């Protein structure tokens, strides 16, 4: 998925 980019920083 690419939606991860919506939570990229998220970590």
Please list, residue by residue across 1-11, b when 16 or more beta carbons sit within 10 angstroms of its beta carbon and e when fewer do: eeeeeeeeeee
Experimental method: NMR
Position of tokens 């919506």?
A: 6
Interatomic CA distance for residues 9 and 2, integer angstroms:
13
CA distance 5 to 11: 12
Q: What is the CB-side half-sphere exposure of residue 10 using CA atoms within 13 A? A: 6
User: What is the rounded distance in angstroms from the CA atom of residue 6 to the CA atom of residue 10?
Assistant: 8
Give dist(CA 4, CA 10) in Å, integer. Answer: 9
């Amino acid at each position: 998925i690419n939606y991860w980019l919506a939570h990229a920083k998220a970590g």
